[PDB]
Amino acid sequence: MEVCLPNGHQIVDLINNAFEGRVSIYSAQEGWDKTISAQPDMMVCGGAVVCMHCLGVVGSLQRKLKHLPHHRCNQQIRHQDYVDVQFADRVTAHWKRGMLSFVCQMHAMMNDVSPEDLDRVRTEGGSLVELNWLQVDPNSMFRSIHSSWTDPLQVVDDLDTKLDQYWTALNLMIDSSDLVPNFMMRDPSHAFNGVRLEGDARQTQFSRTFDSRSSLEWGVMVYDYSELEHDPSKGRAYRKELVTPARDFGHFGLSHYSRATTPILGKMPAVFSGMLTGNCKMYPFIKGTAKLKTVRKLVDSVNHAWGVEKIRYALGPGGMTGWYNRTMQQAPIVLTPAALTMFSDTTKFGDLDYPVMIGDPMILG
């Protein structure tokens, strides 16, 4: 009945949690889930909870909804105004699922090595794995221009821990047998430009944000590793010093940076948390400046839908107006989970080495 609005510091970490693809929702048919729905009924704001038909703070974390209550709500709300969220959320789900299954297959192919050809690599080196890029989940929409968020999702469980241990085995085999695989990045802070932008790959785009403008189907671009075959000039012996990433990545048991791949999916690569983190957490590297303007519409809507001083006292100086102003002002600084700031600071072989253009799954030494 009497209903109000939450803190803003609620909302910035709200943006955090959401853009993690992580928000809890209730369904008029599937109840409390986040798998498949045409209608997000009421939505979580941290420990708090807001009925998204009054957009009013209604619930807490010690509370737990069991069924729709009754209280005066505006009924001036339209799901159209925020589809973008759940859209991107399904994008997150699918994208990460793809990461998961792809590394399943990768590690699988790895676990087949014999001591014979292993000691060949010891003796000569060479690439060892042979997978086509035409077997990477066209069931997904990043690999099919006609799969969609609009589609249901077969659920997954404990993606986290499984990612941890798959990746664990990965770094295990690499820092042990000391490979030079498909993947290594010193500072990915210059992938889209900073690599040799060659061939039709130029049709790759980077908005650093999902958009109805684009489905995200694209190939997967690799570097020029073929030349150590081409030239007899930079192979195993040469590589027995430098191109091995761990020289700069240092130890793996000892860690103070992240680890990442060549650019693969979401039109991107992703980073991974260090061993001294207790986790090797994958993360799509993004920027938040657009995550700013999402609520650009929300502002005016409520500015109507709410009053002068209720709000001027509900949110900080400038109410929602100066709220957005100042928060915009602070965002890229303040909207930066220092996860984002876990790169390396060492490079002696440079990343101005090769172009990148779509390759297929392959790993060498």
Side-chain angles (χ1 to χ4, degrees), residues 12-24:
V12 283
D13 198 17
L14 205 55
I15 305 151
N16 285 103
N17 187 26
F19 269 91
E20 296 139 26
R22 305 310 183 267
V23 176
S24 41

Side-chain angles (χ1 to χ4, degrees), residues 318-363:
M320 200 36 57
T321 311
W323 202 105
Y324 189 106
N325 311 346
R326 186 171 57 258
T327 302
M328 152 265 286
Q329 283 150 241
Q330 54 152 3
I333 315 96
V334 309
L335 191 61
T336 306
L340 179 153
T341 77
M342 301 317 299
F343 280 13
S344 283
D345 288 326
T346 179
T347 308
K348 309 163 305 293
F349 184 42
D351 302 352
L352 271 178
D353 316 344
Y354 304 112
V356 189
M357 191 156 184
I358 295 89
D360 292 15
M362 61 212 169
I363 279 186

Side-chain angles (χ1 to χ4, degrees), residues 261-310:
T261 82
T262 63
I264 321 295
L265 312 183
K267 289 206 153 184
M268 322 291 158
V271 294
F272 293 82
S273 51
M275 191 160 174
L276 294 203
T277 71
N279 52 71
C280 58
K281 296 195 287 186
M282 173 203 75
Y283 283 105
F285 184 81
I286 328 165
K287 272 65 60 183
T289 78
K291 329 189 176 157
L292 162 81
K293 325 163 190 48
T294 78
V295 306
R296 169 67 201 185
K297 49 188 177 178
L298 286 65
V299 184
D300 62 77
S301 48
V302 292
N303 275 126
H304 162 70
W306 275 113
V308 285
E309 299 319 300
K310 189 261 182 179

Side-chain angles (χ1 to χ4, degrees), residues 89-124:
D89 305 340
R90 289 321 181 266
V91 189
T92 302
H94 301 96
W95 183 87
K96 297 168 158 169
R97 259 187 186 81
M99 323 323 296
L100 302 169
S101 295
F102 187 82
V103 292
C104 289
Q105 264 198 8
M106 285 269 294
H107 159 93
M109 305 306 105
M110 152 58 52
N111 283 37
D112 318 333
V113 180
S114 68
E116 321 170 350
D117 301 325
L118 206 48
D119 190 30
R120 180 262 269 178
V121 191
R122 293 272 301 237
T123 321
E124 291 82 7

Side-chain angles (χ1 to χ4, degrees), residues 25-28 30 33-41 79 86 90:
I25 320 289
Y26 187 75
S27 157
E30 311 304 331
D33 187 351
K34 49 201 78 60
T35 318
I36 306 138
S37 174
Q39 167 46 36
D41 315 345
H79 176 203
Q86 308 71 31
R90 289 321 181 266

